[model samples]
Target: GKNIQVVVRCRPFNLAERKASAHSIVECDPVRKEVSVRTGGLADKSSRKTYTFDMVFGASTKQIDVYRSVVCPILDEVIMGYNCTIFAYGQTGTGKTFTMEGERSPNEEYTWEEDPLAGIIPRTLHQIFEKLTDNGTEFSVKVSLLEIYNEELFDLLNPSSDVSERLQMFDDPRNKRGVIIKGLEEITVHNKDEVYQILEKGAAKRTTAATLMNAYSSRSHSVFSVTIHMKETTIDGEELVKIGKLNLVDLAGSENINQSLLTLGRVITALVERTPHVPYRESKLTRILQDSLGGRTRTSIIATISPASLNLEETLSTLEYAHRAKNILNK
Candidate 1:
């Protein structure tokens, strides 16, 4: 019903950036949903590049704040039996992974449920269980994690399999526009405890792959999906089944190996320009997320950026791409 939403998230100066005395070059106005970057002379208004978005979160924004503002509404739509997608895109070290799959500190003071560092995935799963458990609806949740590297798909949720084994994709005959990823393991999650283990195992697999290839996280894209099957009885005691799906995507850095992420840009451009054919088949990532781009799935993009001037060029590029992507309308 609405167009794709594009949001900006500015990360605070990391220890290394601060140690180098990096100055804050980006300023975010959440109220106005604008981000202004000082490209050149600070005193000149012409030197600033400002872009408007659906939402803007400054460095001061906390994990909980982001979840409440962005994920809450999307989760609601998912609960109502709709397909929704949320993706993070940006340059390396811009906090894309941090915003999607955050760390759980080893501190014993707080439970995983109460951990302030928990990111969107964990928070979303927790909220889903909380809401459905008491709604008088019999529901079952299934999750799958897949990573695309070097234009190849690998299953992260397959514990019995090797990360080196690549998965295959084929067109869904039932739904011509849809695809079925063969051999991708979808684990049934019974409760919050199972969620934590699933996330931890999948993250470990990602790390294992990263160790083999340098900077694997920044070079590869990950899609973690949750599907809910709810069985409800109508007022007439007729049994009905409702299905909802949520895709949480963490895209590779904007600076790609020039394959998957490159094709993603082309897909966005084609969709924005209303081209005759959007090349979703050009790359694995785009093909897997075909519905999320300009199709029926309600999509949202969070363009993460660094506040330091050192990454000014990449920050501007991310903002521009995300801005153009906002024009893509989804049914």
Candidate 2:
């Protein structure tokens, strides 16, 4: 089956959750890559349900563990000229940002130091350059970040003080390249640090807001794309050019996060059945991921959830969405 990989991560208790005395109801088995929820009391056996995925990370799972285990192998496809996407989605304060952009204490803020806790994006960038160097592959890397807020697109790399206009998308059925965002700035990066610096600059421009639920909540969907152009010499002394694209997407939280996920699910559901009309036009997020979900591009989704009982509905909904996603992939 041509389905993308899926995973779930349960985050630890924050100060607010701790104050509320919320205990984790989610149980994760990293070895089996399975997770289950026990929402009811010890007597209610019917309250338990389980789900499986490509990988599952517990609250205590470290950054390097995810980097080496789940993310590293994906970059293997990246260097081989395959389009890959990793999108993190869940409710607010569920550690989606921490998993993609890395974690920092309230005191540390957004200064992404490369000490030890860097998340998937930075780690993947570092490894890509490392592997390229180790293989002696001559290549060039270009990266651009885009923010999707209220159905409008803003180029993060653009330095103009006024970010009022929406970036235009050019689409043609004859073009196999899918939708293209014109007038976006793409910066050429040589090393991982350069990539990291570019990301930091872009992060400063992302749309963030403090909600009643969580501070530092992302109010928009942000996509960081890395495009690699490589030169290859055939054994017959022919020169060849190749391209690989990687999209790292961080989606905003919603009261009903499953609605956003259902968009992807519905698209995949339509695709596996070879249906007539896939609903890419229904949403900006779905449109951006149209090629990634149904096309040949490899994709991965890490759905984060809060184990608190107060968030039980959102938790179960997200798990349900993930399970649907998993089952659809197999078909």
Q: Which stretches of candidate 2 lie over 4 Å from their true place?
A: 19-21, 42-46, 105-113, 173-177, 207-217, 232-240, 257-262, 272-274, 328-331
Off by over 4 Å in 1: 43-46, 233-240
Residue-by-residue lDDT tens digits, candidate 1, 37-86: 99875544547889999999999999999999999999999988899999
lDDT for model 1: 0.88
Best by TM-score: 1
lDDT of 2 by residue, 151-257 (tens): 66778777673356578876756756377787888889887668666876666554322222232345677788888898866556766677889999888774453
TM-scores for every predicted model: 0.95, 0.86
List pairs with backbone clashes in candidate 1: none
Index of the highest-lDDT prediction: 1
Q: Which ten contiguous residues of candidate 1 have the minimum total lDDT?
A: 40-49
